[PDB]
Ligand binder design. Structure first.
Ligand SMILES: NS(=O)(=O)c1c(F)c(F)c(NS(=O)(=O)c2c(F)c(F)c(F)c(F)c2F)c(F)c1F
Ligand SMILES: NS(=O)(=O)c1c(F)c(F)c(F)c(F)c1F
Ligand SMILES: OC[C@H]1O[C@@H](O)[C@H](O)[C@@H](O)[C@@H]1O
Ligand SMILES: [Zn+2]
Length: 257
């Protein structure tokens, strides 16, 4: 029953998810000058060559592209991570206008949207067990700015008309998530949480410094989705982002000097 509106949005979540006021909540503002280079970080490895996308779903909060995670087909390793993390899904957060939409901010700057590639630590066997662990998940976050079109996003944009309302799903096989990455893998990293209820504090965040460019037309199609189900009052799926939360006793590390 949580959402993003005035009556059930981020400022209400703590009533049912008290960890919302916890010590390692996400997202955060990334102060680029306070972030510190860490020469200890190992090289980051995004290995998506054998990814198997399955389907796309409007879950009433965002849309998720789900992957076969029954083997080590698309994995994230290295950087701050110990061991292997397997891609399970990606989704976005976006705004009603280009000046807002991201969850993380960079020196308080908000981007038009933010892509999250969600991975779970294979040492825990399944996603559900992983979210009982302080190092259960790794989320690769990528900012979107509006400018030139992103060709590798277009297949996503074009299927959205078929999942307009909550509960609708569609086939989404043979999608390559490598087409959503920027050129550089420079990143910031810190320990945090899911940014949606249940807000569990299980995530190693890896936020890429380089945004991807998408066209206005691409993001406008995100904004034609509905939060509601078919046959219910229409409410546009926009502003599905949680604002920055207190950093508390954390440090953000940079992969780049
Ligand atoms: N803590 S929370 O965000 O998860 C949450 C919440 F903050 C709530 F307020 C409810 N209350 S509600 O009854 O569902 C309800 C709404 F959520 C509405 F948005 C609304 F417009 C209503 F009229 C309404 F009745 C709720 F259940 C819930 F879990
Ligand atoms: N925003 S997020 O990347 O923190 C995130 C998750 F990591 C997750 F596993 C989910 F199930 C979500 F719904 C979600 F929004
Ligand atoms: O005590 C010194 C140490 O302080 C820590 O907070 C920093 O993360 C380290 O990089 C530093 O070496
Ligand atoms: Zn997310």
């Amino acid at each position: 029953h949580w959402g993003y509106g005035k009556h059930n949005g981020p400022e209400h979540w703590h009533k049912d998810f008290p960890i919302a006021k916890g010590e390692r909540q996400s997202p955060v503002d990334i102060d680029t000058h306070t972030a510190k280079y860490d020469p200890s970080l190992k090289p980051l490895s995004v290995s998506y060559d054998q990814a198997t996308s399955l389907r796309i779903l409007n879950n009433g909060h965002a849309f998720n592209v789900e992957f076969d995670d029954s083997q080590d087909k698309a994995v994230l390793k290295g950087g701050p991570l110990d061991g292997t993390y397997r891609l399970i899904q990606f989704h976005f957060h976006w705004g009603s206008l280009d000046g807002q939409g991201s969850e993380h901010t960079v020196d308080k700057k908000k981007y038009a949207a933010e892509l999250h590639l969600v991975h779970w630590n294979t040492k825990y066997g399944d996603f559900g067990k992983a979210v009982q662990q302080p190092d259960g998940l790794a989320v690769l976050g990528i900012f979107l700015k509006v400018g030139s079109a992103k060709p590798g996003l277009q297949k996503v944009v074009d299927v959205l008309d078929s999942i307009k309302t909550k509960g609708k799903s569609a086939d989404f096989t043979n999608f390559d998530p490598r087409g959503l990455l920027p050129e550089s893998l420079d990143y910031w990293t810190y320990p945090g949480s899911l940014t949606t209820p249940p807000l569990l504090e299980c995530v190693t965040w890896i936020v890429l410094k380089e945004p991807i460019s998408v066209s206005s037309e691409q993001v406008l199609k995100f904004r034609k989705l509905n939060f509601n189900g078919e046959g219910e009052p229409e409410e546009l799926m926009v502003d599905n982002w949680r604002p920055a939360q207190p950093l508390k006793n954390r440090q953000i590390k940079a992969s780049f000097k």
